[PDB]
Design a protein around this ligand. Structure first.
Ligand SMILES: *[C@@](C)(CO)[C@](*)(O)[C@H](CC(C)C)NC(=O)[C@H](Cc1ccccc1)NC(=O)[C@H](CC(C)C)NC(=O)[C@H](CCc1ccccc1)NC(=O)CN1CCOCC1
Ligand SMILES: *[C@@](C)(CO)[C@](*)(O)[C@H](CC(C)C)NC(=O)[C@H](Cc1ccccc1)NC(=O)[C@H](CC(C)C)NC(=O)[C@H](CCc1ccccc1)NC(=O)CN1CCOCC1
Ligand SMILES: *[C@@](C)(CO)[C@](*)(O)[C@H](CC(C)C)NC(=O)[C@H](Cc1ccccc1)NC(=O)[C@H](CC(C)C)NC(=O)[C@H](CCc1ccccc1)NC(=O)CN1CCOCC1
Ligand SMILES: [Cl-]
Ligand SMILES: [Cl-]
Ligand SMILES: [Mg+2]
Ligand SMILES: [Mg+2]
Ligand SMILES: [Mg+2]
Lengths: 215, 222, 204, 233, 196, 195, 222, 196, 195
């Protein structure tokens, strides 16, 4: 039962991944410092939406399976194969009550930047843009209107950061802070933690947006 | 809640704790559960807080008008009868559990009333979530021919049993003594055995700690 | 489908030395969706202040109702209503709807013009009065406010100090509640002057 | 998933300076029917432990059998079975608590509330509770069912904390227990007048008292009570 | 509850226990379930304490108003008023009442009123949760035209057994004797009746 | 899911409302106007339970028109919105409540300012720069929150509105068959025929 | 129908310092409105400078702690008496909890100790195994009361530097063990006042490189 | 059902009615509820007819196998086998059984086994739906070391009342006498016992 | 409501399948291919419960490909359809059944005839000239019943198919984001890129 805003999108320079940090137990805000990006390995990322434990446990388990693959095959695992290992696993547990909605993100030679939406009822979708969580609608709006394939890395990082902010503002169960990631062929790069409180006022002033809010 | 009533030689005494809950939360640490129906007829209330206050005030109002109409001091049985008929009519939906006590020209009286409209007579009574803890004390220490000072002791000891052992009850002990031929004495916070200890630190903030966007003078005058 | 937690919101009130303070957040939502950041929950009828949390339609309705009743009170009595009397009016009006109640958590705050004594009070949805020396809390973050107020509060605070204490109680409680926040307002009330300050808080 | 049929009510106990006391009435109820009157719900294990059980009686008889079998098994290939390697209250308790939690985890509980009272080999008093959920706790006073609501308040007036234990004698502690059993007879609708009481002392050992009765009761004031309010006759 | 009323040579005797319960908790151990609706017309109350009290209060009002206009009412008339209330409000009541009274013409009479609101005139009646355990005993031991002392022993022994087996019954045994002589209240304590 | 949107700009109020009427697995109509003119400078759009919507809108319309004739005077948008709120506030505790959500767009001629009011079926009123009902807000508010400026023109407001409809048409599951757009300003109410 | 879960109340608190860490918890055990024990410890020394508490349903809490203590014992056997790091213990506990994903332990788990750099560490778990390292964490009945207070006093949230127009935040800094215990004591006395399931006593376990020390403080017994 | 077993000087006597019901229809008015599990160990059956028959058949099998290996079993042993079945299958059974037997050493013994599967050794036992109405009568009239004729009258009068008040009990009164002399079957018809 | 259609004409089988994938109030994707090639001359489209659809389709695909390698021979559409039916017939009485409906379009090389099979999740097989699953049949069957002739060409079949999609886009409540069309004939399987 976790409110969240997670996104991931393909572009010229690889993949951007952005998430919020809030965890709620009803109305009660349990945490503002939750890590919703799971570092499966140095080349693969996973997002956490739905069950926190289900996502943590099985995407950590996934990293173990990926390490065993490259030990036996002497080759990096494809994003396709990694995502399918996870989707086939949760499909076995279908009906039992697992709750997940995740994006498995990676950049390889044969595939290029690749994103797979994997979900607890067995769904496995390849795509360019994905948004998941209680605040996904708010983030989609900013993404759809501003997204282009030929985005620069600087502008793409801002777009993902701005999209989470949009949801954090409107969605009650999204917020805390923003965690950014850039996925390249040589691995992922962490682009810091950004407190939404400080980030909102900063974006308001610099961008001219959020006129409905007094500041 | 924990509430009790005890009869003695020349009158009757009632007592109550002072906790008021809202789920597992303590809303009021020092609330008054002892109500005045008439000068010498007082009521201890347990259950739904609004209901006990509302029903005691309504009957108290009607008792006053009745006392003026009849040119007589009100009787406990009148308050008892008026309360139970009101509660019975609402089939328990008004969640008031009361201990009614007082002195009148007929003598000293002690009754209890339940939400559905049933009444009981006794020398010692207890109601509320801590009634079992209180009744255990009453059953252990009560005797016939109690004095005023013995009855107050027994009553407050019964409330303390509820305060310590029942999570629904807590804080202080209120008492009201109704003796024949005398004015009723309401002893608010008769015992205060749950005083908060000194805090380890002062949390007084330096001035200007809080960030402010706008200031403005509010006009309360005409 | 719990009327008291659809729209969200909080109100807190405190006493100081020859003063009172009452504060509220500005959020109005429809469950997860935030709708307005200008929804003030504190109203005043003369020098008596009333904060109301709960279902927003009932908040608006009750304000209009007590404005109605206090205006008629003043015309007949030829004087403004006092906090102690207003508290009883609120209780009466709510219990009148005992078996079809307004889903609200009101809070009264003010200073008696005759005696000069600071006064605060709280109610449940059917009119039970909760009078207090120290503080009153209400709303979806009432648990959080109870924890802040019980530790931060001390008696006989000066208006300027009292302002900081109530503001910090509200802000940190609101940040641990999803349905509260999006702005805040604090009223500092002295015998013959009232200051209203808008706080800067995180907007998530 | 069960439902209890034949049941036993409160079991009460407390610590005193040299040992522990435990008591329970001799009734086996069948709903509102007070069906069986010769039921012993205190079961000694060795000469240093007494297990008091409330709840379902068929499940109680099962536990009796387990404890009896536990003594037999401990004696196997054990020359010090009546000495250093004899059964301790802490051993007996942990065994039961293990069983109770395993049974709740299989959704097939033993519908009981148990108090294990005894004295350890080093003289320390042992008093601990366990129930159908596998929940465990210890305290200077322990009670089950109605006893938790009515007896504990009375026993805690004697021993309110740990420091009050050396100050409490066996005479005073026994008096409080017997008084508590009377109060339960006044106020528990599934209780009986007849009961058993057991004392485990570090010096005088195990004293098991059967066929006790509640006495010195107050009923006389009932004659003065007439009607339910207005009635004078 | 355990309650009963028994007719005999000189009149009628009502009998009852003194226990009031809330689940398994005894809310009152010295309850008075024998209640006066008229000088020599009394009733035994079983079921809801609230319902039976409300009913008895109304009946007492009706019979007081009857007496002001038409003089002393019959025991049959009293039972009819009880019935009318219990029958017409059967959906909202839980009350098992035994009506007992003494006339000079009709002598001792007993009417029982179960849940439905039906009326049954009997030589003796038993009711309440504890009555189930003494149907056999009471049927075997009841005789018509017993003496006062015999009738007291019959009620005492009967309610003694009812109390022994029924957890919902206990405390003291109250009795009310209705004869031409007047109205006599009796009480019997545990130490006496338990060891019968 | 009847999509109704509202945007208040510098000198006007713009209301956009979906044209589809669906019943079961069939789109019965694709040209439905989900609005009523309450007065020359006040317009109300609506969405909710079938039947209740039109019945409520026309009932309000009749009451406001009655007021206009009686006083020979147009009620302010604020006054109309308060009247509408009270009717819904009564309704919610009735035997069978009106399950209708509304937006009220009006131009106040005394203040020379446009005004937009959002009122849900419970009687929850708020004045806003931009508003929506149902799931519509979940998509558009992020866009409006971003691109909306308080000093915009009517033409800039229509472009901002087009951006919202495009986003809804992209991400919403149901086909709502486009929108009818209407503008409220100092000169009254008019419809944009080509959208 | 048989319900295998229960609520034994209580509340716990873990704070992490620069070179130390504390794990506190009240000693009260309850069921419904009754008190089972005024002193029933639920914070345990598990070995290897790891302290642990599992609050909620006591039976599940005792089972988990018992299993983890056992896990530590076997880690030594299988890995040449290697010291179990706090991060390794956390991951191990995740697997214990998730092993019962479809019949959970109804507990909120918190562990405290020192990381491999010697700095204070606190980890918190949900009932099914999700975990996170944190500076500050309250768990249990009164977590909602205590936690926003810690946010304000430990992490200095919503506090800005005086005179700076709310532009410059108050700087984060490590607190002393003495200052931390003050906050813990004040946290629990406040929670005791407003939560019925909190009281009786407070037991704190402090963890430094020297070892595990204990401190006990009385709380209100109402 | 109404069933009972009573110990006396020379041994033990089992007693039962003969009614079997399906709702309010009497499926069998001449049922035999007294059943042999061993030469001088019998049982009274109450509850489900299917369950009690299946149980008794298994117990008879267990005691026949016991006898082949270890000789004649005790009445306590028989009660233990019954208990084991009733306790371990308590979720799927509805059986209230009274076990009664005669040893030469232990004489007459009676064990009762209620729904839960608990065992209770008693001087006498009563069970079944109709037993509720005779708890008072049986408690007042039972004496230890009665004669055969006294015990027969006690059971006859007791079950007579149980049958009179319980609609689920009726027909004939079957009895089985267990002594050193042997096994004697008795029967008593309505015309006799009804007018007691 | 994942639209899947099928039309058997003179010399080919045409399958049309919707592109939308919806989850809650969001269209997650608008370019989804709801089909798998079982063999060079056999194509299967599918629709139903999320996860089950793809898992089932790929499982069938693997089994048919295994058969092809083992025997160095392509199974007839009739044989493949029978195998698929039996798998669903097993499934329906399992602990957790596959909730998947399929159309199987194939060209039989021995008979030189196109063949279309409709199989629902219960294992209910029928050979048809035209077929559909879900609510799709409720709109299109009347059109196909009318304009369909057995001697039509592939181009005539595509025009007939366009007519069905237009009717669905007009009257269906949900936006299914168009269709991917594929043709199965003597030369194998190919996709129509512009539809
Ligand atoms: C002991 C302390 C507890 O048993 C006593 O019995 C006291 C009696 C004194 C105070 C007169 N009882 C209570 O304090 C009583 C306990 C209780 C709670 C709920 C139902 C029945 C009894 N508490 C109350 O009545 C509080 C009083 C508040 C603290 C001023 N009221 C509530 O808890 C109300 C319940 C109102 C109610 C409505 C309809 C039927 C029954 C009760 N609950 C809320 O306000 C909760 N919620 C908050 C958000 O707004 C919507 C309601
Ligand atoms: C014997 C006990 C049974 O036949 C007697 O008949 C006596 C009659 C005397 C007192 C005249 N009956 C009772 O004592 C009676 C038993 C009973 C209970 C419920 C329904 C019918 C009969 N007890 C009561 O009426 C008590 C008296 C109070 C404690 C002073 N009242 C309750 O138990 C109320 C009754 C509410 C009610 C329910 C259905 C119909 C009418 C009224 N119940 C509660 O308070 C609920 N209780 C809350 C605590 O948890 C357990 C349930
Ligand atoms: C007295 C009657 C009650 O204590 C005795 O105990 C005797 C015991 C003798 C026969 C050993 N009991 C019965 O006669 C017994 C009463 C009974 C009924 C249901 C459950 C438990 C006890 N009657 C039966 O067992 C009959 C015997 C048949 C007619 C030969 N069986 C039924 O009534 C069956 C039982 C099904 C069942 C239900 C629950 C648990 C076990 C078995 N029920 C039906 O046929 C249903 N019937 C259909 C027609 O409409 C009414 C219901
Ligand atoms: Cl009564
Ligand atoms: Cl049979
Ligand atoms: Mg937010
Ligand atoms: Mg307490
Ligand atoms: Mg019969």
């Amino acid at each position: 039962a976790l409110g969240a805003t997670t996104l991931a999108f393909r572009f010229q320079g690889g993949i951007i991944v952005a998430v919020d940090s809030r965890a709620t137990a009803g109305n009660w805000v349990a945490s503002q410092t939750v890590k919703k990006v799971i570092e499966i390995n140095p080349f693969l990322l996973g997002t956490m939406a739905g069950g926190a434990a289900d996502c943590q446990f099985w995407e950590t388990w996934l990293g173990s399976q990926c390490r065993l693959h490259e030990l036996r095959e002497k080759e990096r695992i494809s994003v396709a194969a990694a995502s399918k290992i996870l989707s086939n696993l949760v499909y076995q547990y279908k009906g039992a009550g697992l709750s997940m909605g995740t994006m498995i993100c990676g950049y390889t030679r044969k595939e290029g930047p690749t994103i797979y939406y994997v979900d607890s009822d067995g769904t496995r979708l390849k795509g360019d843009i994905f948004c998941v969580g209680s605040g996904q609608t708010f983030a989609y709006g900013v993404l759809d209107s501003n997204y282009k394939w030929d985005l620069s890395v600087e502008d793409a990082l801002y777009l993902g950061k701005r999209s989470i902010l949009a949801a954090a503002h409107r969605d009650a169960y999204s917020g805390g802070s923003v965690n950014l990631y850039h996925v390249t062929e040589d691995g992922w790069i962490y682009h810091g933690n950004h407190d939404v409180g400080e980030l909102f006022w900063k974006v308001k002033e610099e961008e001219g947006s959020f006129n409905n809010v007094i500041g | 809640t924990t509430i009790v009533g005890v009869k003695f030689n020349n009158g009757v005494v009632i007592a109550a704790d002072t906790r008021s809950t809202q789920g597992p939360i303590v809303a009021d640490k020092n609330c008054a559960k002892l109500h005045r129906i008439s000068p010498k007829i007082w009521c201890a209330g347990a259950g739904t807080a609004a209901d006990t206050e509302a029903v005691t005030q309504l009957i108290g109002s009607n008792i006053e008008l009745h006392s003026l109409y009849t040119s007589r001091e009100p009787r406990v049985v009148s308050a008892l009868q008026m309360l139970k008929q009101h509660l019975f009519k609402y089939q328990g939906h008004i969640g008031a559990y009361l201990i009614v006590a007082g002195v009148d020209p007929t003598g000293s009286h002690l009754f209890s009333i339940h939400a559905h409209g049933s009444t009981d007579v006794g020398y010692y009574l207890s109601l509320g979530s801590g009634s079992l803890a209180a009744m255990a004390v009453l059953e252990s220490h009560w005797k016939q021919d109690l004095t005023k000072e013995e009855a107050i002791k027994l009553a407050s000891d019964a409330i303390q049993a509820g305060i310590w052992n029942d999570l629904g009850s807590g804080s202080n002990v209120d008492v009201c003594v109704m003796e024949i031929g005398k004015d009723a004495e309401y002893l608010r916070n008769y015992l205060t055995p749950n005083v908060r200890e000194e805090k380890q630190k002062s949390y007084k903030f330096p001035r200007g700690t809080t960030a402010v966007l706008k200031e403005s003078i509010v006009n309360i005058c005409d | 489908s719990d009327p008291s937690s659809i729209n969200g919101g909080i109100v807190v009130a405190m006493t100081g030395k020859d003063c009172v303070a009452i504060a509220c957040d500005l959020r109005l939502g429809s469950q997860s969706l935030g709708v307005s950041n200008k929804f003030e929950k504190i109203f005043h009828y003369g020098h008596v202040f009333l904060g109301i949390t709960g279902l927003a339609t009932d908040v608006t309705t009750l304000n209009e109702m007590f404005r109605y009743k206090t205006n008629l009170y003043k015309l007949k009595e030829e004087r403004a209503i006092e906090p102690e009397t207003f508290t009883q009016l609120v209780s009466s009006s709510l219990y009148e709807r005992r078996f079809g109640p307004y889903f609200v958590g009101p809070v009264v705050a003010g200073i008696n013009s005759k005696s000069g004594k600071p006064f605060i009070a709280g109610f449940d949805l059917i009119g039970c009065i909760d009078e207090a020396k120290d503080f009153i809390v209400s709303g979806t973050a009432s648990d959080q406010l109870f924890g802040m107020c019980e530790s931060l509060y001390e008696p006989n605070l000066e208006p300027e100090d009292l302002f900081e204490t109530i503001s910090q109680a509200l802000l940190n409680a609101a940040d641990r509640d999803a349905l509260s926040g999006w702005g805040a307002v604090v009223y500092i009330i002295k015998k013959d002057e009232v200051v209203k300050r808008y706080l800067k808080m995180r907007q998530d | 998933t069960q439902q209890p049929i034949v049941t036993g009510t409160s079991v009460i106990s407390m610590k005193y300076d040299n040992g522990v006391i435990i008591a329970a009435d001799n009734l086996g109820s069948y709903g509102s029917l007070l069906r069986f009157n010769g039921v012993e719900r205190l079961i000694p294990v060795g000469d240093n432990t007494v297990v008091g059980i409330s709840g379902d009686i068929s499940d109680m008889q099962h536990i009796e059998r387990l404890l009896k079998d536990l003594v037999t098994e401990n004696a196997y290939d054990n020359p010090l079975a009546d000495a250093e390697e004899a059964l301790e209250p802490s051993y007996i308790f942990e065994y039961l608590a293990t069983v109770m939690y395993q049974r709740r985890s299989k959704m097939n509980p033993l519908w009981n509330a148990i108090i294990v009272a005894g004295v350890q080999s080093n003289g320390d008093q042992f008093l601990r509770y366990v129930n159908l959920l596998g929940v465990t706790y210890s305290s200077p006073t322990l009670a089950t069912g109605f006893g938790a609501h009515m007896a504990n308040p009375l026993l805690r007036k004697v021993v309110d904390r740990e420091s009050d234990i050396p100050k409490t004698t066996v005479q005073v502690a026994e008096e409080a227990i017997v008084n508590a059993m009377r109060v339960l007879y006044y106020r528990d609708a599934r209780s009986s007048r007849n009961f058993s009481l057991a004392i485990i002392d570090k010096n005088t050992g195990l004293t098991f008292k059967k066929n006790l009765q509640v006495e010195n009761m107050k009923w006389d004031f009932a004659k003065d009570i007439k009607g339910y309010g207005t009635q004078k006759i | 509850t355990s309650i009963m009323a028994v007719t005999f040579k000189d009149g009628v005797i009502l009998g009852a226990d003194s226990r009031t319960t809330t689940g398994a908790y005894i809310a009152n151990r010295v309850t008075d379930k024998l209640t006066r609706v008229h000088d020599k017309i009394w009733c035994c109350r079983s079921g809801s304490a609230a319902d039976t009290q409300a009913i008895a209060d109304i009946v007492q009002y009706h019979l007081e108003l009857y007496t002001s206009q038409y003089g002393t009412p019959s025991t049959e008339t009293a039972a009819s008023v009880f019935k009318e209330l219990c029958y017409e409000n059967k959906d909202n009541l839980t009350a098992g009442i035994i009506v007992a009274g003494y006339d000079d013409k009709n002598k001792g009479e007993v009417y029982t009123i179960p849940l439905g609101g039906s009326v049954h005139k009997l030589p003796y009646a038993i009711a309440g949760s504890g009555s189930t355990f003494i149907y056999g005993y009471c049927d075997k031991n009841f005789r018509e035209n017993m003496s006062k002392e015999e009738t007291v022993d019959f009620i005492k022994h009967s309610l003694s057994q009812a109390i022994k087996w029924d957890g919902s019954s206990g405390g003291v045994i109250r009795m009310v004797v209705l004869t031409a002589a007047g109205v006599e209240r009796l009480i019997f304590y545990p130490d006496e009746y338990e060891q019968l | 899911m009847d999509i109704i949107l509202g945007i208040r700009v510098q000198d006007s109020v713009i209301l956009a409302s979906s044209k589809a009427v669906t019943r079961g697995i069939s789109v019965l109509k694709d040209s439905d106007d989900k609005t009523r003119q309450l007065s020359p400078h006040t317009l109300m759009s609506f969405a909710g339970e079938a039947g209740d919507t039109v019945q409520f809108a026309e009932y309000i319309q009749a009451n406001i028109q009655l007021y206009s004739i009686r006083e020979d005077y147009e009620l302010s948008p604020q006054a109309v919105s308060s009247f509408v709120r009270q009717e819904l506030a009564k309704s919610i505790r009735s035997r069978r409540p009106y399950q209708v959500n509304v937006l009220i767009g009006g131009y106040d001629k005394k203040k020379n300012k446009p005004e937009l009011y959002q009122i849900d079926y419970l009687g929850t009123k708020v004045e806003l720069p931009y508003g929506a009902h149902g799931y519509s807000g979940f998509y558009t508010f992020s866009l409006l929150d971003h691109h909306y400026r308080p000093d915009m023109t009517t033409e800039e407001g229509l472009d901002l509105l087009k951006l919202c409809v495009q986003e809804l048409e992209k991400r919403m599951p149901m086909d709502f068959k486009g929108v009818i757009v209407k503008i409220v300003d100092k000169d009254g109410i008019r419809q944009v025929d080509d959208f | 129908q048989f319900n295998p879960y229960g609520d034994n109340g209580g509340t716990i608190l873990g704070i992490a310092g620069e070179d130390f860490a504390v794990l506190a918890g009240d000693t009260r055990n309850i069921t419904d409105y009754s008190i089972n024990s005024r002193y029933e410890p639920k914070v345990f020394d598990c070995g290897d400078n790891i302290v642990m508490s599992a609050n909620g349903f006591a039976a599940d809490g005792d089972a988990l702690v018992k299993r983890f203590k056992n896990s530590v014992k076997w880690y030594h056997f299988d890995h040449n008496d290697k010291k179990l790091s706090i991060n390794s213990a956390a991951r191990n506990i995740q697997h214990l909890l998730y092993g019962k994903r479809f019949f959970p332990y109804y507990v909120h788990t918190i562990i405290a100790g020192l990381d491999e750099d010697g700095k204070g560490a606190v980890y918190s778990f949900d009932p099914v195994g999700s975990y996170e390292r944190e500076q500050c964490r309250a768990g249990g009945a009164a977590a909602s009361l205590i936690m926003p207070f810690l946010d304000n006093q430990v992490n200095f949230k919503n506090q800005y530097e005086p005179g700076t127009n709310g532009k410059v935040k108050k700087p984060l800094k490590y607190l002393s063990v003495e200052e931390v215990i003050k906050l813990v004591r004040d946290s629990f006395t406040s929670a005791t006042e407003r939560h019925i399931q909190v009281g009786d006593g407070l037991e704190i376990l402090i963890v430094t490189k020297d070892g595990v020390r204990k401190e006990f403080y009385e709380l209100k017994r109402d």
